[PDB]
From a paper:
Here we present the high-resolution electron cryo-microscopy structure of the Arabidopsis respiratory supercomplex consisting of complex I and a complex III dimer, with a total of 68 protein subunits and numerous bound cofactors. We propose that the main role of the plant supercomplex is to stabilize its components in the membrane.
The redox reaction in the peripheral arm is energetically coupled to proton translocation in the membrane arm of complex I. Coupling is based on an aqueous passage that leads from the ubiquinone binding pocket to the ND5 subunit at the tip of the membrane arm.
Author numbering:
A (entry chain Z): 19 to 45
B (entry chain U): 40 to 126
C (entry chain V): 12 to 151
D (entry chain W): 10 to 106
E (entry chain q): 31 to 110
F (entry chain C): 1 to 181
G (entry chain D): 10 to 394
H (entry chain P): 67 to 382
Write the structure that this text describes.
């Protein structure tokens, strides 16, 4: 009918796509 | 003692038999001097056939730039009778 | 004026004397193209863009200015194109394809069936002004 | 090595025919070994079959047709030798034995 | 005692601990659910009546959709 | 570099005897040439500063049985330099060899082998021209219109010979041709 | 030189891969692929099909990137028909194309990694692959060969709730990419297996018809989504990663980055997805609704016509290409005015890439051959057709 | 063809060639097997979908037999065994089953053609007990079915034969080949494919083969020493024949025959030192001049050298 | 024989249990069906957990999965690999292409079903069959293996 | 370049510092829950659109829905449907079929459908040659689920 699958009002929450750093290690 | 060339008489008999029993050569024109084309009723394809038969019977390959001169039995026997690769 | 460290293109070495190389290649080209008949469009096209590029190279001493004014890639790619044009000029002297045959016929078709906006379409954008000057000089 | 241009006339085409026939005949012992034919058929019958195939097309007068026939013969010989598909009484397209 | 040789059945018995009985079909197969979130909240499974010689084709049509998350209707609601 | 500039500039600059037909259309710019000028035309387009057609995208044959030269060989090319595509076509028959362009585009090697396999068109100066897709010892050229869809032979294991063997085809249920025209 | 005949009769290395290598010790002198082991006569079969019946052949060419080939064929047919696709369908097409790109890159990267001995990333990545297969199945009813993208748009509209689940997937996919990277990117063994292996210059890539990652690895900025955009790609933000060394390591990094950019594109498609029709409204080329066909004569007639004879395509010919996950995938379509394609030539990037194996593998070790094959991303369904 | 053939004993040597040839002529072939379902697996590839149908039966059970025979108009029996097991004697395997099959075919009523396969040396006055049982079975089938056809092939040669393969195995494992009778017995060995072709031809005729026995021998007559030489030319090995006189060979073949019907567990089958076959080696087994040869079936048998012995390549 | 049959049946049950619990397939990954087969071996379905381990050499294999289209060019390679498999051995035909030629049935280059080249024990339908469908097919193979009575048939032979 | 950076590079190379992170995050997954499905007690998710085993349907009165229009036979990309005619013969070769669902789209009376079953592997090729009676049995067996799925999917098609 008149209802189609789509984003909610305001759109979806932002998503990260870039690599995250990790400074783990005594070195 | 060990030699390096087949005997002339042996090569003569071998080539004579090969030509005699070939396909279209009645064993009556086959002389040790008979020419393939003029005297044996053989076309160029058949003469190439006979020369290739000479290769199998003596177990070695005759150069393409040398087979053009083997046109009779005498030239043949001259060639194989002195070639060291002949067996 | 700063030396280029990379072209960013694998196998395309930096040419630090690109101005002199380009000037020599273009002068060689403007000499060797004279073996082609003057009436042939190939000769006029080559002379046109080769002379424009040669003038730009002669005027500008900094290769960055040459790349900027030309609108045509790094000086290394401009060198590749100049060498290829020289090679082509040699093959064309040897082929001698010039002139028009006696019973020469040629069918032109300008098919105008439209295509949808959404299907893949190459839209490069306008060329540097010298391309259009070359084309209009060829037509006239 | 590369595919040669088309024969300009019947003489050079005939020369290519003779070269192909020599190459085909010289490969007979390899074929006899590969297909184990020692007790099935004589090598001369193979030579005779090749020559008969050459003779059945002796009426061709167009050098381009001859060149194409030679190319196809070379491909068939190569597949027979390099990529043999053993049956029993059959090599490629010829009934052997 | 089937748990000792049949490790596949053992996993079902373990994961049945704390489960909710949803229904039983005409063959006696029992249907359980958890209402948690481990396999993205997919916690439906069937305990076959035959503890040996069980086979996936023994799930009847009314329960097949429920088992495969095709529908939220159990076999009983479909039959009614 | 748009298709109007390519059409006009190629008319102005190419030697006239190379091109028999020039089409400008949203379906693609198209140049038709005799077989004897195909190599030189492609070399020109690749080398010339204002074309720089560096990528050979593919070569394919098309069969037209109603034509004296039944085969049409199509060269699809790309200029990454100018973000443009060009199509160059020539016709051929069953016995006339045409020039290979491997020395111009190394990518042509396999596409030419494919044309020979599928259609039977041969290529002069091709370094290694043999079939590439069909089974070894295949007979015929399957993409010709007169070649039957199921071919002529099929294979099966033959226990008495202990090997896979080829026999003339036998179809349990024949292909049904539905003519909706 | 000795000759090693390598055919892996298992999907560890393709499955129909057959290589004749000439070696000088462990050094490869010449690599000669033998192909046609999956040649199934697709191009001949297509000529006997209507344009709709031909569509499933394209799912089975690069059968890891199903919807991309569907998309290319639909685009070619749309181009010859001059058919206008609705915007919502355009967005769905691009969304599924980028899901497919992620599906392809995960498989390619982790099968290569397993080939060089890293076992775990394969399992990790294939779970994410399973989630994406579920979106394929929810829209089409098939995990792989959806036949969902069609001339004029898409077969059916999205089921309610699908966009939300896709958003949930996108919220976590970056961490999965990061895990794959930490497993591989910085590891000294991984670098030793890939750095300076299979180096390709830009000139070589152009000469051998390379495309996609195989071309961008050599520093050539070229992506058909930007050079010759289609559907809604010009409304979307994404970067085109390019290499600087032209080796296997650069191409691996490019594929990782391409997955990140695909995630970006998917997020944008989800947020910009409009309402409206998913099929072109021209009533001579698209199926009517089930209720319309059961209620209206014109609709019934059109349904009968469409599913028996299929639509006609006016006589013409064109080449259409898209940026498939493996590179430029093209279709040369010839129409004669009838309801069946007169000729359909399929241009597969793997055909060019595998032809390049000889020059790429020259003077490398035996164990580098599988690495080079993996960086090429060969699927023989498209190589052989 | 509209022939539906139930071929008993088709899981052995001759069976595969016979089933292949029957499927070529379009006949539907039913293949009764007594043990593992994997025994007829190699026959399923032959013929089109549904054309070859393996079916479990039991020999010592009349119901199963008529069950596998209930749909056929042609019955071919190949069942036999050249050695003994504690469960089946020579007469049990080579005479009782054949008579039972003939009786069931008589009570069936619909069997147009019945083919019983025997051995060439089958006679009442034979040293070999298997040959004696074979002759008895011939008589029993003929009495139960006077219109039945009898085939008497010689020692058959092929990929799975039980003469050249055991010889090659023994030679490759020991280095020498024994000769049981000084290598002098004569026999005319025959290509197994020719035997299958003769059976097919007798099934195909206008009815002339009914009631008659055919003696199918190979084109040529050899000594066991002469055959051992084809094996050595083909296996590319250095021959080394050792004369084993008959009493010594019988001594080495006595233990199995002795303890086969006493110990309660199965024994391995004999390869070379089978007592019954050694007894058969005492006399020469040749095709009689008054019999019906491959001629009168319009067939020319194949010579052994080359293709019939090509399977010996595997031993080099 | 009231005691021998019981021991024989127990021996056969042990043999069948061993052979069903350790099935080592070699995969003939020809086309798209190989991808679903890869998914079956992956974490969600985990063929390892049933004792199914995929082997590289036919010499260590008990089962051959034919997953994909078989061309005429490939058929000899498939048959030779099958002939290197030691007994007992089974063949699973996966997908329409392997089953009967599928979408390519009428092609000039395709074998119309792998059962023209090798004997097939189980046919798994679909194009491609789902990973779960392949797992169901492998459970059917177990069912077939569990009807074997090798020890009993040999005792009576 | 500098003694500190050279020393740090040397220590990182000697102490395999970057190899530690891979070990650590491999170990982290060791304790997390597993994603494996306990087939056949547990199954993977499917949708009402899933294209599985075809089936022929009847009206609630018991009358067949199919009226032998032959549209499904015409559209079938694999030519797997054979019809004679109400039908007197309706065959689907399950080994030719590509499970595309075109036949279900073409049918004007919802007679032929691809139902939800995917577990129908067989031991013989002939059992995969479905005739009309077998398809009608499938329809009777799966009718309730098929009808539910059709109710769900009628809002999209
Ligand atoms: N050299 C030769 O081979 C010669 C053989 N013959 C005869 O020709 C016939 C076919 O020969 P060939 O194929 O080599 O024979 P094989 O021994 O190879 O095959 C015998 C067949 O009979 C079956 N069989 C044996 N004993 C029994 C039994 N007690 N109950 C049921 N079935 C049984 C076997 O079944 P299973 O596999 O289940 O054990 C098998 O199918 C036999 O009658 C043989 O004696 C004639 C002359 C020479
Ligand atoms: C096992 C085998 C493997 C290889 C099989 C290869 C099979 C190849 C089949 C095709 C071969 C051809 O026809 S190759 C083409 C052959 N056709 C011609 O040569 C036509 C011109 N005719 C002539 O030259 C003369 O008639 C001629 C008698 C030939 C000689 O000349 P002479 O009269 O002055 O002797
Ligand atoms: S059956 Fe279908 S999925 Fe499997 S290989 Fe064939 S076309 Fe691909
Ligand atoms: S699913 Fe597709 S291929 Fe199979 S019968 Fe239906 S329409 Fe034909
Ligand atoms: S389309 Fe539907 S009504 Fe027509 S023949 Fe097929 S199943 Fe029957």
């Amino acid at each position: 009918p008149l209802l189609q699958d789509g984003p909610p009002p305001g759109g979806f929450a932002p998503v990260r796509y870039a690599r995250r750093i990790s400074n783990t290690g005594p070195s | 003692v060990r030699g390096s060339f087949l005997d002339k008489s042996e090569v003569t008999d071998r080539v004579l038999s090969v030509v005699k029993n070939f396909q279209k050569v009645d064993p009556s024109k086959v002389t040790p001097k008979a020419n393939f084309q003029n005297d044996l009723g053989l076309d160029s394809l058949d003469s190439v056939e006979v020369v290739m038969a000479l290769e199998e019977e003596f177990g070695f390959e005759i150069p393409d730039n040398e087979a053009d001169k083997i046109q009779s039995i005498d030239l043949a026997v001259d060639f194989i009778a002195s070639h060291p690769q002949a067996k | 004026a700063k030396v280029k460290q990379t072209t960013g293109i694998v196998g395309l070495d930096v040419v630090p004397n690109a101005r002199a190389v380009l000037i020599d290649l273009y002068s060689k080209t403007l000499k060797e193209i004279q073996a082609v008949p003057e009436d042939e469009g190939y000769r006029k096209a080559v002379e046109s863009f080769t002379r424009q590029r040669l003038n730009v190279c002669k005027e500008e001493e900094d290769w960055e200015m040459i790349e900027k004014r030309l609108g045509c890639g790094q000086v290394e790619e401009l060198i590749e194109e100049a060498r290829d044009e020289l090679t082509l000029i040699g093959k064309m002297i040897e082929w001698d394809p010039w002139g028009v045959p006696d019973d020469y016929e040629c069918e032109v078709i300008e098919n105008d069936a439209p295509i949808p906006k959404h299907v893949p379409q190459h839209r490069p954008g306008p060329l540097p002004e010298q391309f259009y000057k070359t084309l209009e000089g060829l037509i006239a | 090595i590369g595919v040669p241009p088309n024969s300009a006339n019947l003489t050079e085409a005939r020369r290519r025919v003779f070269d192909f026939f020599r190459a085909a005949c010289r490969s007979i012992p390899t074929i006899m070994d590969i297909y184990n034919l020692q007790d099935v058929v004589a090598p001369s019958q193979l030579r005779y079959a090749i020559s008969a195939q050459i003779r059945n097309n002796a009426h061709i007068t167009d050098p381009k047709v001859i060149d194409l026939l030679i190319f196809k013969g070379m491909e068939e010989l190569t597949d027979i030798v390099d990529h043999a598909k053993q049956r029993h009484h059959i090599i490629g397209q010829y009934v052997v034995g | 005692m089937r748990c000792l040789p049949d490790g596949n059945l053992l996993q079902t018995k373990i994961h049945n601990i704390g489960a909710t009985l949803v229904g039983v079909d005409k063959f006696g197969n029992k249907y359980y659910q958890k209402l948690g979130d481990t396999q993205y909240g997919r916690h439906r499974w069937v305990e076959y009546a035959s503890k040996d010689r069980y086979n996936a084709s023994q799930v009847p049509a009314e329960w097949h959709g429920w088992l495969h998350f095709i529908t939220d209707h159990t076999g009983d609601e479909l039959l009614s | 570099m748009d298709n109007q500039f390519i059409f006009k500039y190629s008319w102005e600059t190419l030697p006239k005897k190379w091109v028999k037909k020039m089409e400008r259309s949203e379906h693609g710019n198209r140049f038709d040439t005799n077989t004897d000028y195909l190599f030189q035309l492609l070399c020109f387009l690749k080398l010339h500063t204002y074309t720089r057609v560096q990528v050979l995208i593919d070569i394919c044959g098309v069969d037209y049985p109603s034509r004296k030269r039944r085969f049409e060989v199509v060269y699809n090319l790309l200029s990454t330099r100018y973000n443009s595509r060009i199509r160059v076509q020539t016709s051929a028959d069953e016995v006339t060899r045409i020039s290979s362009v491997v020395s111009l585009f190394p990518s042509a090697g396999w596409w030419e082998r494919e044309v020979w396999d599928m259609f039977g068109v041969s290529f002069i100066n091709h370094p290694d021209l043999r079939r590439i897709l069909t089974d070894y010892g295949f007979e015929g050229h399957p993409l010709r219109k007169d070649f039957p869809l199921s071919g002529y032979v099929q294979v099966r294991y033959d226990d008495p010979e202990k090997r896979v063997v080829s026999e003339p085809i036998e179809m349990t249920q024949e292909f049904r041709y539905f003519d909706f025209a | 030189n000795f000759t090693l005949n390598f055919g892996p009769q298992h999907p560890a290395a393709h499955g129909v891969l057959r290589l004749v290598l000439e070696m000088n010790g462990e050094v490869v002198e010449r690599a000669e692929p033998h192909i046609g082991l999956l040649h199934r006569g697709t191009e001949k079969l297509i000529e006997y099909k209507t344009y709709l019946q031909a569509l499933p052949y394209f799912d089975r060419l690069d059968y890891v990137s199903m919807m991309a080939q569907e998309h290319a064929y639909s685009l070619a047919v749309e181009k010859l028909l001059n058919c206008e696709v609705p915007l919502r369908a355009q967005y769905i097409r691009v969304l599924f194309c980028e899901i497919t790109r992620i599906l392809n890159h995960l498989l390619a990267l982790t099968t290569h990694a397993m080939d060089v001995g890293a076992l775990t990333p394969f399992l990790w990545a294939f779970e994410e692959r399973e989630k994406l297969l579920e979106f394929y199945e929810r829209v089409s009813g098939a995990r792989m060969h959806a036949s969902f993208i069609r001339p004029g748009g898409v077969a059916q509209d999205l089921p309610l709730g699908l966009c939300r689940d896709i958003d949930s997937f996108t919220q976590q996919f970056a961490s999965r990419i990061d895990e794959l990277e930490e497993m591989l990117t910085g590891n000294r063994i991984w670098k030793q297996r890939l750095v300076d292996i299979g180096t390709v210059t830009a000139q070589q890539a152009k000469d051998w018809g390379f495309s996609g990652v195989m071309l961008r690895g050599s520093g050539v900025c070229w992506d058909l989504r930007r050079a010759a955009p289609y559907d809604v790609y010009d409304q979307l933000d994404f970067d085109v990663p390019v290499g600087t060394r032209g080796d296997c390591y650069d191409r691996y990094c490019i594929r990782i980055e391409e997955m990140r950019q695909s995630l970006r594109i998917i997020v944008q498609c989800l947020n910009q997805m409009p309402s409206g029709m998913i099929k072109a409204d021209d009533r001579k080329l698209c199926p009517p609704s089930r209720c319309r066909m059961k209620l209206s004569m014109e609709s019934l007639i059109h349904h009968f016509e469409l599913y028996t004879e299929g639509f006609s395509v006016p006589a013409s010919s064109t080449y259409t290409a898209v940026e498939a996950p493996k590179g430029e995938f093209g279709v040369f379509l010839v129409s004669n005015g009838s309801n069946r394609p007169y000729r359909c030539k399929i241009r597969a990037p793997g055909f060019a890439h595998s032809q390049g194996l000889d020059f790429m593998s020259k003077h490398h070790m035996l164990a580098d051959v599988v690495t080079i094959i993996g960086t090429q991303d060969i699927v023989f369904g498209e190589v052989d057709r | 063809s509209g022939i539906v053939a139930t071929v008993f004993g088709a899981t052995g040597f001759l069976g595969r060639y016979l089933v292949q040839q029957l499927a070529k002529m379009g006949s539907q072939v039913l293949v009764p097997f007594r043990g593992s379902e994997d025994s007829p697996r190699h026959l399923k590839l032959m013929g089109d979908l549904g054309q070859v149908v393996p079916m479990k039966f039991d020999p010592r059970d009349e119901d199963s037999i008529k069950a596998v025979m209930a749909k056929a108009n042609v019955v071919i029996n190949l069942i036999g065994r050249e050695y003994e097991t504690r469960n089946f004697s020579f007469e049990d395997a080579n005479h009782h089953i054949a008579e039972k099959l003939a009786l069931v075919a008589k009570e069936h009523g619909g069997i147009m053609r019945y083919i019983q396969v025997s051995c060439l040396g089958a006679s009442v006055s034979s040293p070999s007990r298997m040959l004696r049982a074979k002759a008895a079975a011939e008589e029993a089938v003929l009495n139960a079915l006077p219109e039945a056809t009898i085939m008497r092939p010689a020692t058959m040669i092929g990929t799975e034969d039980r003469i050249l393969n055991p010889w090659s195995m023994f030679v490759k494992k020991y280095g020498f080949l024994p000769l049981i009778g000084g290598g002098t017995t004569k026999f005319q060995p025959v290509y197994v494919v020719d035997v299958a072709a003769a059976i097919v031809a007798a099934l195909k005729d206008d009815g002339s083969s009914m009631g008659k026995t055919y003696e199918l021998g190979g084109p040529d007559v050899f000594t066991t020493h002469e055959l051992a030489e084809i094996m050595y030319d083909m296996i590319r090995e250095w021959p080394r024949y050792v004369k084993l006189p008959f009493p010594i060979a019988k001594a080495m073949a006595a233990p199995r025959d002795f303890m086969v019907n006493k110990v309660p567990f199965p024994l391995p089958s004999p390869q070379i030192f089978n007592l019954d076959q050694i007894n058969a080696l005492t006399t020469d087994t040749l095709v009689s001049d008054n019999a019906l040869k491959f001629q009168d079936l319009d067939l020319v048998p194949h010579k052994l050298k080359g293709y019939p012995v090509e399977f010996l390549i595997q031993y080099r | 024989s009231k005691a021998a049959e019981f021991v024989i049946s127990k021996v056969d049950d042990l043999m069948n249990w061993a052979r069903t619990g350790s099935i080592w397939p070699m995969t003939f990954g020809l086309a798209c069906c190989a991808v679903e087969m890869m998914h079956t071996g992956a974490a969600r379905y985990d063929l390892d957990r049933f004792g199914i381990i995929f082997r590289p050499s036919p010499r260590q294999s008990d089962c051959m999965i034919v997953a994909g289209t078989l061309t005429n060019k490939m058929a000899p390679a498939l048959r030779k690999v099958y002939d290197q498999m030691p007994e007992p051995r089974w063949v699973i035909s996966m997908g329409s292409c392997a089953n009967g030629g599928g979408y390519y049935h009428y092609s000039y280059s395709v074998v119309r079903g792998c059962d023209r080249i090798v004997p097939v024990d189980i046919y798994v339908p679909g194009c491609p069959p789902t990973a779960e469908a392949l797992l169901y097919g492998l459970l059917q193979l177990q069912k077939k293996i569990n009807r074997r009575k090798d020890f009993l048939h040999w005792w009576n032979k | 370049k500098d003694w500190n950076t050279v020393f740090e590079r040397s220590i990182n190379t000697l102490f395999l510092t970057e190899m530690v992170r891979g070990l650590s995050l491999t170990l982290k997954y060791f304790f997390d829950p597993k994603v494996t499905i306990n087939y056949p007690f547990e199954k993977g998710p499917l949708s009402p659109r899933f294209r599985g085993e075809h089936a022929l349907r009847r009206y609630p009165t018991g009358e067949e829905r199919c009226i032998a229009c032959k549209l499904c036979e015409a559209v079938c990309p694999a030519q797997a449907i054979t019809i004679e005619a109400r039908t007197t013969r309706y065959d689907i070769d399950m080994t030719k079929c590509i499970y595309c669902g075109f036949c279900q789209e073409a049918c004007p009376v919802d007679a032929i459908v691809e139902g939800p079953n995917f577990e129908f592997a067989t031991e013989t090729h002939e059992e995969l040659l479905y005739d009309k009676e077998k398809l009608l049995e499938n329809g009777d067996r799966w009718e309730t689920e098929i009808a539910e799925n059709l109710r769900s999917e009628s809002l999209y098609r």
